[model samples]
Target: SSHKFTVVVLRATKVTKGAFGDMLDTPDPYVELFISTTPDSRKRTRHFNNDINPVWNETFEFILDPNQENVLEITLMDANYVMDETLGTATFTVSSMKVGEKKEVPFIFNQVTEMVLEMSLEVASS
Candidate 1:
């Protein structure tokens, strides 16, 4: 347990309002993977523009800290130029995860109604 490593291999996000009635302002979307470590690894995604459905297909990895909680949080953010607004958030716990399979999770906010996602994770070897 103390010698295991963690990797974040799968990541993505989306926004929806059904066909027409559920549409929203075209967003400048980005992702933030928080670890409570300010200068932490895999903390965010680049800002994306003008789309209701944003796909952040990025592969990021982080070394495991067996002595720490190692909780990873994902945020769906909209850029405000100066102040970014959080649209929703999803979090995954990697403390007890196994080494071979990936997990799919979803992020939801009180203000955001439609949300879904697919994620993959693995314990790396080296």
Candidate 2:
């Protein structure tokens, strides 16, 4: 069966500093979600300026093979003008989720930054 997941990226709290110098007080932060099938599909959130507790509330959808183990990689990033820097990352295993079940999952980074994601899984025909 194929699984359809609706992921709602909520917010992050107590995120670590991402600035190299003392020029900025806090990092302009954004989030990126990745799956194996669409490796090039860079699903992301808009960056929040100088905020440690950043909120996105953005929704993303994905379809996956339920028979195979699906790994969801989420990264917290500091947006720069040219290149963004990685603040932290978390790998979530989403193969075992039950259909019609909604979960409030927390992907924590470096024990400092924590991102809250709400997800619901729907199973399609075999």
Candidate 3:
């Protein structure tokens, strides 16, 4: 049997700017999160327009199998009509989390870009 966990895509601040359209324009940013080894669990937040500090309080649940290695991947991207560009990407080892544990980790993309994620593993009663 597999375990289950809930992840909250809380919010981000100090994201990069001028990376999308005009050289002087701010970007429309969003977040993409998934298990690196299992892409089927991918999910994303709604895009915020022209905002350096965006808040996306979305929640997602993922299955955790003890037999396979799991890594949580986070990508911050800028939306555009032509092509969406990446702001930053980060990976976290999810296999090391203890069951029934709650954690709030900062997914750092760079010195200027970071996102906060809240995670809580479900108990065995499931």
Candidate achieving the largest lDDT: 2
Clashes of 2: 0
Angstrom error at residue 44, model 2? 0.9
Q: What is the C-alpha lDDT profile of model 3 across 1-126, one tens digit per residue? A: 577767898888877853543365677889888885554798898999888788998998887776678777888988878888888888877776888888998877768777999988875435
**Candidate 2 lowest-lDDT run of ten:** 17-26
When 2 and 3 are scored with TM-score, the better candidate is 3
lDDT of 1 by residue, 4-30 (tens): 333332333345333452354556777
Per-model TM against the reference:
0.67, 0.86, 0.87
What is the per-residue lDDT of model 2 for residues 30-90, given as tens digits with 9 covering 90 to 100?
8999887643545889999877899999999888777666788888988888878888888
Point out the worst 10-residue segment of candidate 1 by lDDT.
Answer: 2-11
Of the candidates numbered 2 and 3, which has the greater lDDT value? 2
Query: Top model by TM-score, which number?
Result: 3
The RMSD of every model to the true structure, in order and in angstroms, is 4.4, 2.6, 2.3
**Candidate 1 displacement at residue 1 in angstroms:** 5.4
